[PDB]
Design a protein around this ligand. Structure first.
Ligand SMILES: *[C@](O)(C(=O)N1CC(F)(F)C1)[C@H](C[C@@H]1CCCNC1=O)NC(=O)[C@@H]1[C@@H]2[C@H](CN1C(=O)[C@@H](NC(=O)C(F)(F)F)C(C)(C)C)C2(C)C
Ligand SMILES: *[C@](O)(C(=O)N1CC(F)(F)C1)[C@H](C[C@@H]1CCCNC1=O)NC(=O)[C@@H]1[C@@H]2[C@H](CN1C(=O)[C@@H](NC(=O)C(F)(F)F)C(C)(C)C)C2(C)C
Ligand SMILES: [Cl-]
Lengths: 306, 306
């Protein structure tokens, strides 16, 4: 029993983290095979970052201008290219600790683990959700750029996030590993703000199933609803629309608990309209939307990774 | 910016996890050098666990009765001994991935990372606190026994917890790595309950400093208090007494923010007496007591591990 925000074990990713320095700018890189991936603004000074011309700064750089360290080992750069907002440095050494891996662009609502790094070294690990507004609610200090987000499937690391920047309200934006931002952000220091966020409904329902599984069942009412009535009531509270796909995704939890998805929807509608009235669910006084159905299943069914 | 419950990177510990089977009971073991450490009730059947005689069951076991697997590799046991509630299996292979390490018995209030495992494989990682009542609020399914808790200091893993059991209310109990339980629990299936828990005051204050650092400052009042008046008011709310040691421990955060500890104490007193009145601090609607001063410093100063 119990239900915690749980990250994926980080060891496979730890063995991929390097320090990248260019001029006086140092951040983190991801060393896979014989390529180091890092945010392309490693090639800027502070000054430059207000409105940088990245292809101009990069044309003026030679391989030797990039210092890549993996512990007390310098890796010689033998090539470099820019892919969108990500810089690729070819090195003369393939990373022996390269795991089985993919690059995935995740969808709003999907979670991942962030391995927060400084100077190519891990600080710690925690789970995040890609928010509907294409931000994450992270913990990142200066030096954290190049820190990555990932999922593990069994033996395979799916890299989905590389950290670039922090927006007002202390939320975070970055790219997939092909250097395309999530959301409308740009890698320059100018006024940008996150869009107004929404609550990930399917995830809140998953979390309500997690509660039931753990014996926290007070919020279950005797009623059902239609997907129609549910979506109308939830729109008022800034909840995303629940789709039939979302309903189908919730099937495993629904089947495990014997609670139809539209019954849980009725229970949630009552929580939204009536609030929690001094009560907690799974320790929490607010509804949690940063557990996916799969996360709930993994945690409550003990899925592991090799 | 941002403030997340962050675990230590798990890679050093992952390389130490094995599966231990004895008869039909399988759980996790910790492989350091040429010793595998696991809960001693691996040598029980279900039946046995209601009131086991561990030294009797163990005398009837031979080395070969313990199957230790590390991936698709069986490690031959060449010795076995019991230390309190922990079984030590000497194996014929020293673990090549053994990190620099210590065994520490942590104090109530101190945090650690748990690497939750099943069948010797990692499921995920999350942070916990040793509660004043010597339980942790974990996430552990059947098969999780032998999962360990740890801290990383730079390069050195301090192992402080090995998981044994789950109590009513879905909280968890276990041992240090010398097999002594935290708290009054015993490794047998009989009625045991956690003592009534208390809130870790020093940790809540640390978390209030974290909030200030992140710009969440609404709860700061203009007042100060004495350590005396604070401790009287906090006793009513089931908060632990704050000691001068705790005050001294909070010095770094106090100095960084310019807020005296007894001013923060005044702010907290007001929160306890008046509640939060619909407001959140760092995303949270309840006061959080599972971040230590050091955790706050690490996260808000970017301490890393090699
Ligand atoms: C990242 O570049 C980094 O860690 N380092 C080390 C270094 F200084 F050498 C480069 C940082 C990470 C930031 C720093 C503030 C705390 N948390 C973080 O995530 N990224 C940046 O500093 C990026 C790069 C320039 C500006 N910027 C920002 O994050 C800024 N944001 C914005 O301008 C805004 F649009 F509002 F989002 C800043 C104001 C937070 C500094 C780039 C190229 C966008
Ligand atoms: C641990 O032994 C384990 O994971 N495994 C795999 C196995 F079955 F082969 C042995 C489990 C972990 C438990 C299981 C329930 C979910 N979460 C957990 O942490 N530990 C136990 O099962 C221990 C051992 C016998 C009984 N027990 C308990 O946890 C029981 N608790 C109690 O009796 C009580 F005192 F209330 F705390 C149980 C009722 C939760 C099964 C030992 C030797 C104490
Ligand atoms: Cl909360």
């Amino acid at each position: 029993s119990g239900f915690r925000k749980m990250a994926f074990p980080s060891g496979k990713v730890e063995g991929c983290m390097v320090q990248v320095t260019c001029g006086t700018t140092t951040l983190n890189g991801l060393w896979l095979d014989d390529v180091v991936y890092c945010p392309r603004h490693v090639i800027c000074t502070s000054e430059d970052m207000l409105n940088p011309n990245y292809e101009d700064l990069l044309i003026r750089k030679s391989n030797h201008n990039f210092l890549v360290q993996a512990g007390n080992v310098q890796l010689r750069v033998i090539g470099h290219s820019m892919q969108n907002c990500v810089l690729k440095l070819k090195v003369d050494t393939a990373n022996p600790k390269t795991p089985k891996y993919k690059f995935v662009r995740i969808q709003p609502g999907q979670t991942f683990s962030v391995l927060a790094c400084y100077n190519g070294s891990p600080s710690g690990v925690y789970q995040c959700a890609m928010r509907p507004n294409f931000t994450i609610k992270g913990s990142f200090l200066n030096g954290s750029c190049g820190s990555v987000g990932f999922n593990i499937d069994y033996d395979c690391v799916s890299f989905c996030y590389m950290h670039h920047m922090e927006l007002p309200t202390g939320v975070h934006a970055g790219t997939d590993l092909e250097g395309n931002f999530y959301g409308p952000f740009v890698d320059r220091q100018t006024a940008q703000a996150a869009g107004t966020d929404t609550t990930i409904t399917v995830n809140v329902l998953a979390w309500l199933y997690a509660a039931v599984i753990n014996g926290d069942r007070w919020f279950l009412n005797r009623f059902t609803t239609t997907l129609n009535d549910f979506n109308l009531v939830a729109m008022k509270y800034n909840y995303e629309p629940l789709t039939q796909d979302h309903v189908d995704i919730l099937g495993p939890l629904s089947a495990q608990t014997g609670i139809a998805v539209l019954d849980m929807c009725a229970s949630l509608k009552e929580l939204l309209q009536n609030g929690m009235n001094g009560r907690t669910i799974l320790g929490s006084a607010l509804l949690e939307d940063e557990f996916t159905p799969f996360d709930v299943v993994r945690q409550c069914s003990g899925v592991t990774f090799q």
